[PDB]
Design a protein around this motif. Structure first.
Motif, PDB file in Angstrom:
ATOM      1  N   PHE A 140       0.841  -1.189   0.000  1.00  0.00           N
ATOM      2  CA  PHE A 140       0.000   0.000   0.000  1.00  0.00           C
ATOM      3  C   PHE A 140       0.879   1.243   0.000  1.00  0.00           C
ATOM      4  CE2 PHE A 140      -3.955  -2.244   1.099  1.00  0.00           C
ATOM      5  CZ  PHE A 140      -3.444  -3.415   1.592  1.00  0.00           C
ATOM      6  N   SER A 141       0.318   2.348  -0.480  1.00  0.00           N
ATOM      7  CA  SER A 141       1.085   3.581  -0.568  1.00  0.00           C
ATOM      8  C   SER A 141       0.151   4.765  -0.395  1.00  0.00           C
ATOM      9  CB  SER A 141       1.857   3.676  -1.899  1.00  0.00           C
ATOM     10  OG  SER A 141       1.023   3.434  -3.017  1.00  0.00           O
ATOM     11  N   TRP A 142       0.686   5.816   0.217  1.00  0.00           N
ATOM     12  CA  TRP A 142      -0.011   7.084   0.322  1.00  0.00           C
ATOM     13  C   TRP A 142      -0.025   7.794  -1.030  1.00  0.00           C
ATOM     14  CZ3 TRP A 142      -1.969   7.363   4.994  1.00  0.00           C
ATOM     15  CH2 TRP A 142      -1.263   6.819   6.071  1.00  0.00           C
ATOM     16  N   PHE A 143      -1.046   8.610  -1.255  1.00  0.00           N
ATOM     17  CA  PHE A 143      -0.983   9.539  -2.370  1.00  0.00           C
ATOM     18  C   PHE A 143      -1.766  10.784  -2.000  1.00  0.00           C
ATOM     19  CE2 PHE A 143      -5.237   8.781  -4.207  1.00  0.00           C
ATOM     20  CZ  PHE A 143      -5.557   7.549  -3.629  1.00  0.00           C
TER      21      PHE A 143
ATOM     22  N   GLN B  64      -9.182  10.699 -12.059  1.00  0.00           N
ATOM     23  CA  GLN B  64      -9.334   9.332 -11.575  1.00  0.00           C
ATOM     24  C   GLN B  64      -9.356   9.289 -10.054  1.00  0.00           C
ATOM     25  OE1 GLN B  64      -9.882   6.503 -13.558  1.00  0.00           O
ATOM     26  NE2 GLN B  64     -10.468   5.757 -11.527  1.00  0.00           N
ATOM     27  N   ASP B  65      -8.496  10.072  -9.394  1.00  0.00           N
ATOM     28  CA  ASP B  65      -8.531  10.126  -7.940  1.00  0.00           C
ATOM     29  C   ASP B  65      -9.935  10.463  -7.447  1.00  0.00           C
ATOM     30  OD1 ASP B  65      -5.892   9.481  -7.863  1.00  0.00           O
ATOM     31  OD2 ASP B  65      -5.192  11.412  -7.069  1.00  0.00           O
ATOM     32  N   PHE B  66     -10.563  11.473  -8.050  1.00  0.00           N
ATOM     33  CA  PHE B  66     -11.880  11.883  -7.584  1.00  0.00           C
ATOM     34  C   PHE B  66     -12.895  10.770  -7.775  1.00  0.00           C
ATOM     35  CE2 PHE B  66     -13.365  16.417  -6.725  1.00  0.00           C
ATOM     36  CZ  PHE B  66     -14.271  15.983  -5.766  1.00  0.00           C
TER      37      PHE B  66
ATOM     38  N   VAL C 218      -3.778   0.455  -3.165  1.00  0.00           N
ATOM     39  CA  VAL C 218      -3.102  -0.827  -3.320  1.00  0.00           C
ATOM     40  C   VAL C 218      -2.173  -0.716  -4.516  1.00  0.00           C
ATOM     41  CG1 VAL C 218      -3.398  -3.319  -3.560  1.00  0.00           C
ATOM     42  CG2 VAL C 218      -5.131  -1.949  -2.400  1.00  0.00           C
ATOM     43  N   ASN C 219      -0.899  -1.046  -4.317  1.00  0.00           N
ATOM     44  CA  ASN C 219       0.077  -0.849  -5.383  1.00  0.00           C
ATOM     45  C   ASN C 219      -0.230  -1.730  -6.585  1.00  0.00           C
ATOM     46  OD1 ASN C 219       1.397   0.972  -3.793  1.00  0.00           O
ATOM     47  ND2 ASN C 219       2.938  -0.499  -3.072  1.00  0.00           N
ATOM     48  N   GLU C 220      -0.572  -2.999  -6.340  1.00  0.00           N
ATOM     49  CA  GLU C 220      -0.713  -3.957  -7.435  1.00  0.00           C
ATOM     50  C   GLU C 220      -1.942  -3.682  -8.289  1.00  0.00           C
ATOM     51  OE1 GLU C 220      -0.600  -8.080  -6.438  1.00  0.00           O
ATOM     52  OE2 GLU C 220      -1.884  -8.699  -8.117  1.00  0.00           O
ATOM     53  N   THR C 221      -3.018  -3.194  -7.687  1.00  0.00           N
ATOM     54  CA  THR C 221      -4.270  -2.972  -8.392  1.00  0.00           C
ATOM     55  C   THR C 221      -4.618  -1.500  -8.589  1.00  0.00           C
ATOM     56  OG1 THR C 221      -5.612  -3.003  -6.370  1.00  0.00           O
ATOM     57  CG2 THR C 221      -5.112  -5.138  -7.410  1.00  0.00           C
ATOM     58  N   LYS C 222      -3.914  -0.576  -7.940  1.00  0.00           N
ATOM     59  CA  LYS C 222      -4.227   0.853  -7.952  1.00  0.00           C
ATOM     60  C   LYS C 222      -5.566   1.168  -7.292  1.00  0.00           C
ATOM     61  CE  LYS C 222      -0.489   1.837 -10.242  1.00  0.00           C
ATOM     62  NZ  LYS C 222      -0.635   2.666 -11.466  1.00  0.00           N
ATOM     63  N   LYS C 223      -6.164   0.213  -6.596  1.00  0.00           N
ATOM     64  CA  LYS C 223      -7.462   0.446  -5.982  1.00  0.00           C
ATOM     65  C   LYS C 223      -7.296   1.231  -4.687  1.00  0.00           C
ATOM     66  CE  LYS C 223      -9.694  -1.352  -9.260  1.00  0.00           C
ATOM     67  NZ  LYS C 223      -9.993  -2.803  -9.367  1.00  0.00           N
TER      68      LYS C 223
END
Ligand SMILES: CCCCCCCCCCCCCC(=O)SCCNC(=O)CCNC(=O)[C@H](O)C(C)(C)COP(=O)(O)OP(=O)(O)OC[C@H]1O[C@@H](n2cnc3c(N)ncnc32)[C@H](O)[C@@H]1OP(=O)(O)O
Ligand SMILES: Cc1cnc(NC(=O)c2cccc3[nH]c(-c4cc(Cl)ccc4N4CCNCC4)nc23)s1
Ligand SMILES: [Cl-]
Ligand SMILES: [Cl-]
Length: 426
Positions: free
Chosen positions: A43-46, A56-58, A105-110
């Motif tokens: 996982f990662s912060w953004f 896309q974020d929104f 989630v890094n792997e899925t970008k979810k």
């Protein structure tokens, strides 16, 4: 027993102080953790790009909150904040890009986590400060009960402190630590058939749908004219209106109100910051006054007290001199019916800030209720903050479930009535 909140500078439920006082709980301008907090691997912060409503974020944030944000006690309803609402609620004047915090989630970008802070200005008794409001804390349901929430809270805390801000305001529908006030939910039923079909209310055995409709009707007579939606050019007059309102209900002297201690200027020093401590002789000195409230400059007024369809409604009353003398405002949030596929959502109005000078607060709320109806709101929701109890009494509002606890991070406020609190969170 807490494992996180017992370590934080907030008043604890078992706090044993025999005096009423105000001021910072700690003055620690450089001792806080500055390193980013670790998330679980993968996982990662953004920084969430809510600056383009098409981003896309929104879309991800909207979808996360739609499916995982606040539900009512019995999981019948869940909030469905619109993108337009979130933009209005989070892209406020002075907002920082890194106060909109996602977890991906890094792997899925979810996107599986969100927490936000917005900047606001508040007066707390004899002090004034730039502070923060934390809101929209949300973790994906599949990740609940894994202690991610303290991680998000610590990380937003770090990001707020990096902006030289060491206090925050937040609310919660449950008791965490000791709240400085407790708000009660009050619901005014507008669209009876829709709210029956949604399961929010039921038809009493001594009633019928027609008699229920009759009883919950918004009264029609006794209309007061001169109201109209606000426009941008009203901002200066509205800003002045709020100043006089808060001056009217101040819990400090006139000279103090014109000479508030600016905590921004002293929070960098353990010695100067002590000037913010204030012992209150009697709690009765605060009765029927406002002790903590948001402060609005003209830029703030232009943003908050505007009119955006299905988001925020602001009307003002003019007098015969065409001067603004009254204001009512409410925001609009849709809720999903969780256990319903055919009747999926409902529009709910929420009382915001209201100033009555030429009419009674009851008269003003009646005009606002009709305006909420004309905006297709199915119910009108209000808290017993400020002078709203005057309207809630001898009215047809019905009590809600639970209570709204108000908290201040790293400040001492005596327990006060919600009538003393002029802070509305989205
Ligand atoms: C100087 C600047 C300071 C800035 C920061 C100021 C503070 C801001 C604080 C936040 C302001 C929020 C404002 C709003 O947005 S209020 C609305 C909160 N959001 C929701 O209710 C949406 C649906 N629920 C969820 O998404 C999750 O259930 C959440 C994320 C809420 C908790 O996730 P989860 O269910 O997976 O739990 P955990 O196992 O990770 O964590 C357990 C720990 O977390 C403490 N906990 C649980 N819920 C809340 C809560 N709503 N406020 C504060 N603390 C909370 C809990 O006491 C325990 O600590 P302790 O009891 O063991 O000590
Ligand atoms: C058909 C329906 C009519 N009202 C519905 N409410 C919900 O489902 C709901 C679920 C969970 C938590 C809630 N809190 C409030 C609320 C209620 C009032 Cl009266 C005033 C303020 C309030 N809140 C809004 C959220 N921020 C804090 C203040 N409502 C809810 S569903
Ligand atoms: Cl409580
Ligand atoms: Cl209750």
């Amino acid at each position: 027993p807490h494992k996180f909140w017992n370590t934080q500078p907030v008043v604890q439920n078992d706090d044993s102080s025999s005096e009423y006082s105000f001021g910072p709980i700690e003055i620690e301008p450089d001792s806080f953790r500055k390193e980013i907090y670790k998330l679980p691997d993968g996982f990662s912060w953004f920084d969430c790009n809510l600056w383009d409503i098409e981003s896309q974020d929104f879309e991800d944030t909207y979808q996360l909150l739609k499916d995982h944000y606040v539900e009512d006690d019995d999981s019948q309803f869940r909030f469905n904040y619109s993108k337009e609402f979130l933009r209005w609620a989070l892209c406020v004047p002075g907002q920082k890009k890194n106060w909109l915090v996602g977890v991906r989630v890094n792997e899925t970008k979810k996107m599986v986590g969100f927490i936000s802070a917005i900047p606001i200005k508040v007066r707390i008794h004899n002090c004034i400060m730039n502070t923060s409001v934390v809101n929209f804390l949300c973790v994906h349901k599949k990740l609940r009960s894994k202690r991610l929430a303290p991680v998000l809270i610590k990380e937003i805390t770090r990001r707020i402190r990096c902006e030289k801000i060491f206090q925050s305001i937040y609310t919660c529908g449950k008791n965490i630590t000791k709240p400085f006030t407790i708000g009660t939910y009050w619901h005014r039923i507008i669209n009876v058939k829709k709210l029956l079909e949604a399961g929010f209310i039921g038809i009493p055995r001594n009633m019928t749908m027609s008699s229920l409709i009759k009883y919950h009707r918004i009264p029609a007579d006794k209309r007061i004219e001169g109201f109209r939606p606000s426009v941008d050019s009203d901002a200066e007059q509205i800003c002045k209106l709020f100043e006089n309102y808060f001056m009217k209900y101040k819990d400090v002297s006139n000279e103090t109100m014109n000479n508030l201690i600016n905590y921004d200027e002293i929070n960098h020093s353990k010695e100067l910051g002590k000037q913010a401590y204030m012992k209150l002789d009697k709690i009765e000195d605060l009765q029927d006054k406002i002790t903590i409230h948001q402060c609005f400059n003209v830029e703030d007024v232009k943003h908050y007290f505007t009119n955006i369809d299905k988001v925020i409604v602001t009307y003002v009353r003019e007098n015969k001199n065409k001067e603004i003398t009254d204001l009512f405002s409410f925001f609009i949030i849709e809720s999903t019916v969780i256990n319903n596929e055919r009747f999926p959502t409902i529009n709910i109005a929420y009382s915001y800030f209201n100033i009555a000078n030429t009419c009674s607060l009851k008269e003003l709320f009646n005009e606002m209720l009709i305006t909420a109806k004309n905006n297709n709101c199915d119910a009108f929701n209000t808290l017993d903050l400020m002078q709203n109890l005057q309207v809630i009494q001898d009215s047809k509002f019905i009590i809600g479930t639970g209570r709204l606890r108000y908290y201040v991070f790293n400040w001492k406020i005596p327990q006060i009535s919600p009538s003393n609190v002029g802070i509305i969170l989205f």
